[PDB]
Amino acid sequence: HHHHHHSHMGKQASASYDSEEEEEGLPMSYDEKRQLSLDINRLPGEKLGRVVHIIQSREPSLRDSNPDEIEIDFETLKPTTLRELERYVKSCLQKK
Amino acid sequence: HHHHHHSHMVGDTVWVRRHQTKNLEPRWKGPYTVLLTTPTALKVDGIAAWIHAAHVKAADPGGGPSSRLTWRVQRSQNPLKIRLTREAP
Structure with missing residues (x-):
């Protein structure tokens, strides 16, 4: 016999597009x-591991040459892959 | 100047090479715990005989499992580009 209460109440998500982004x-x-x-x-080599992971997962290079x-x-990298890899490493570190 | 002496630690596990003609097929066995120690010989457990220290080798602890293929940043002809080189384990 041991009684201790938890507590978690409320949950809501509100998000949409960043911009129109009619381009890629x-x-x-x-x-x-x-x-x-x-x-x-x-x-x-941990974050260098993540950068080479994403670029070679979309477009391989080193394995051939x-x-x-x-x-x-x-x-000169695609701004899609840049902004994707950017937010990825930013959420991978969560540091300010 | 080379003193005929092999420092063998009493208590250490050592591989004892089979004393006879110089062939690669008679190898060492054990490894056996050193009981007795003299400047040129040592007596160990299991073999129940004195062995000359030239015919004996000290056993390894184990090693160090350490491996990771990683990337190294070199300065290249770049604005904000990098060159990542895969290093050894």
Whole structure:
């Protein structure tokens, strides 16, 4: 015989589109490319593991041509994949 | 200057190579706990005989399981691009 109460009440989700986004998704500034750039490469093979995971999962490269090296060209990378990989690493760290 | 001495620790498990003609097929067995220690020989458990320390080898603890293929950032001809190189385990 031991009695202790929990407590969880209320739940609501409210969200829609960010913008119209009639295109694929290119509302990214150069600053956005710069932000995901340093944030990825400063962090070890864990986040470098996540960046190479996503780019090679959509478009493979290294496995065909020199698997010991990969270059992630953010400035000429698709802004869809950039903004996707950006929000992914941001929610992967949850740090401010 | 080489003193005819092998430091074998008493209490250590050591592989005792079968004393006879120099063939790779007579190998060591055990490993046996060192009971007695002299400058040039040692007596161990299991074999119940004195062995010359040149014909003996100290056993390994185990090792260190440490592996991970990882990416390393080099400075390239870049605005904000990076070059990730897969390093050894």
